Design a protein around this ligand. Sequence first.
Ligand SMILES: *[C@@H]1O[C@H](CO[C@@H]2O[C@@H](C)[C@@H](O)[C@@H](O)[C@@H]2O)[C@@H](O[C@@H]2O[C@H](CO)[C@@H](O)[C@H](O)[C@H]2NC(C)=O)[C@H](O)[C@H]1NC(C)=O
Ligand SMILES: *[C@@H]1O[C@H](CO[C@@H]2O[C@@H](C)[C@@H](O)[C@@H](O)[C@@H]2O)[C@@H](O[C@@H]2O[C@H](CO)[C@@H](O)[C@H](O)[C@H]2NC(C)=O)[C@H](O)[C@H]1NC(C)=O
Ligand SMILES: *[C@@H]1O[C@H](CO)[C@@H](O)[C@H](O)[C@H]1NC(C)=O
Ligand SMILES: *[C@@H]1O[C@H](CO)[C@@H](O)[C@H](O)[C@H]1NC(C)=O
Ligand SMILES: *[C@@H]1O[C@H](CO)[C@@H](O)[C@H](O)[C@H]1NC(C)=O
Ligand SMILES: CCCC(=O)SCC[N+](C)(C)C
Ligand SMILES: [Cl-]
Ligand SMILES: [Cl-]
Length: 522
Amino acid sequence: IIIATKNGKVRGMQLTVFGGTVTAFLGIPYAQPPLGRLRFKKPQSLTKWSDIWNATKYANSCCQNIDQSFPGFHGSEMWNPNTDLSEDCLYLNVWIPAPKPKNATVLIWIYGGGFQTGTSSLHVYDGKFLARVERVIVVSMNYRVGALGFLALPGNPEAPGNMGLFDQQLALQWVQKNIAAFGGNPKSVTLFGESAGAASVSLHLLSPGSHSLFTRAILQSGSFNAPWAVTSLYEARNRTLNLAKLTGCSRNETEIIKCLRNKDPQEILLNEAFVVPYGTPLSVNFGPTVDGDFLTDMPDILLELGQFKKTQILVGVNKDEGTAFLVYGAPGFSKDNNSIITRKEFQEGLKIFFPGVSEFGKESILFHYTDWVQRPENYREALGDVVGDYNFICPALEFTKKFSEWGNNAFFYYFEHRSSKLPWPEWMGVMHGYEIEFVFGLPLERRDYTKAEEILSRSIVKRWANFAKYGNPQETQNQSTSWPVFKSTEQKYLTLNTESTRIMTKLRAQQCRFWTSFFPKV
Ligand SMILES: *[C@@H]1O[C@H](CO[C@@H]2O[C@@H](C)[C@@H](O)[C@@H](O)[C@@H]2O)[C@@H](O[C@@H]2O[C@H](CO)[C@@H](O)[C@H](O)[C@H]2NC(C)=O)[C@H](O)[C@H]1NC(C)=O
Ligand SMILES: *[C@@H]1O[C@H](CO[C@@H]2O[C@@H](C)[C@@H](O)[C@@H](O)[C@@H]2O)[C@@H](O[C@@H]2O[C@H](CO)[C@@H](O)[C@H](O)[C@H]2NC(C)=O)[C@H](O)[C@H]1NC(C)=O
Ligand SMILES: *[C@@H]1O[C@H](CO)[C@@H](O)[C@H](O)[C@H]1NC(C)=O
Ligand SMILES: *[C@@H]1O[C@H](CO)[C@@H](O)[C@H](O)[C@H]1NC(C)=O
Ligand SMILES: *[C@@H]1O[C@H](CO)[C@@H](O)[C@H](O)[C@H]1NC(C)=O
Ligand SMILES: CCCC(=O)SCC[N+](C)(C)C
Ligand SMILES: [Cl-]
Ligand SMILES: [Cl-]
């Protein structure tokens, strides 16, 4: 099938899904390749073409270091790019129902990866199931990551910072100007993403330039107020310079960029890892910064003072968000044994996750998380919760609380089902990033998951779809639990699992009081 867009014609491909058919347009360019003099600069508008652009395969993934901690292991390799890496990577994908819809709601996915990795061609981000089952149009895009996408030199158009965020924004603009041609409704666009993707979504809720580019937002395990989500102006500076020295580019800050623009992508990727003296396993070396363009002030200030797009949001986290990072630096941990660690190892673990923190700061963490209720796995579980609560759960809850205080309906979920096919060991539980497959409906495919998981995925897909279409995450036909709005007082949230869905209140009340009130002082 051939669709006519503002920049030219594009041909897609037909896909057979669940006895039906979906039309996919993989790899549509949405900006001039950020190459040469364009490296480090904001994305430039694309040059219109003649003839038909074949959008029948995923495009290149942006340059990024790859996870090599477990060669041959599907647990980690499933997140690695499955497409050739290249600086020429500003492309997006579109999955539309068949027959062509007339005014369908649009779901725009923004992948996570700590702003350093990720790509939209991953198997778990395939939008064809949603396009098929819910008749929504699914869009996803690749955006620059790492130094190539977030190198910051505030005020300098050569390397202003947040380039990756601008790529996402330019992609959202593309949908505004072109989605109607694919039978989509530019007035009904819901953004959703996980981890850094979620933090990205939350930042679009704060960026004036993105206000008119979408309707609603879904944030899975992430928000800009997460401690790893925004790079301080000081950090950015010390990192841009450290990268300069490491590539023999130290200089006129503008000449520094000119020098870096001659370096080979690999030389840059190779040195990104040492810009931080003692980084944590989250390793967000180059991320969003208050640039004065995309972000006009410290996000915490904007959130606190109600300066953001007023709309409905759906926010949530997984039960064991932190476990996954333990095997990437925490001493005594391993995906090949029960990882029963000691108090001493736990203490060294804190050193790893809280590098620049005072000794008293770490002791307070120990004090708060070690009042045992003896059990050999006490420290193993405490460290996991420490990492999860500090980096994801508490920041997500705080964001939800503050956001809803300004009148908008908000819904919060607590994902507690561990995939029956999870490659990681049992002690890691309901891991970070493993609810994604349920949202994209992979379990709907019987060729693979238990019956219970198929049903769970179906319910989630319906709730996510209803939220996108109507701003209300309900499943109204199968006598399902009603999802209550989250309010600052009651703080009700919904648990998602195979057993039975429940309405609970004040998730991690004691732990977040610690991370949100006390800790920020030390
Ligand atoms: C800001 O950066 C300095 C310099 O970092 C060093 O040079 C970079 C290019 C990279 O190779 C880093 O690994 C180097 O550390 C940091 O100061 C260094 O701190 C480490 C701590 O282990 C020490 O070993 C070095 O001697 C220090 N180098 C200098 C010149 O002071 C500094 O810590 C960074 N600032 C912050 C807030 O972390
Ligand atoms: C779980 O494994 C860790 C890591 O050890 C490695 O992986 C194992 C599966 C096995 O292949 C080992 O030979 C590998 O070295 C164990 O942690 C190590 O413990 C020893 C002694 O306590 C220590 O000298 C190492 O530095 C540790 N390595 C690190 C940094 O984790 C851990 O003891 C194992 N847990 C169990 C079952 O006790
Ligand atoms: C696009 O695919 C069609 C398939 O028949 C082919 O004819 C055409 O040459 C392709 N376009 C390019 C530029 O290769
Ligand atoms: C799509 O729906 C919007 C309202 O949500 C409406 O304004 C627009 O005309 C519709 N587009 C179509 C079907 O032409
Ligand atoms: C509702 O229940 C039916 C049959 O009991 C099931 O096949 C279907 O998947 C469910 N629909 C949703 C949206 O969960
Ligand atoms: C590095 C710790 C384990 C991970 O989270 S790997 C990537 C996960 N995701 C891309 C889904 C955010
Ligand atoms: Cl102390
Ligand atoms: Cl239910």
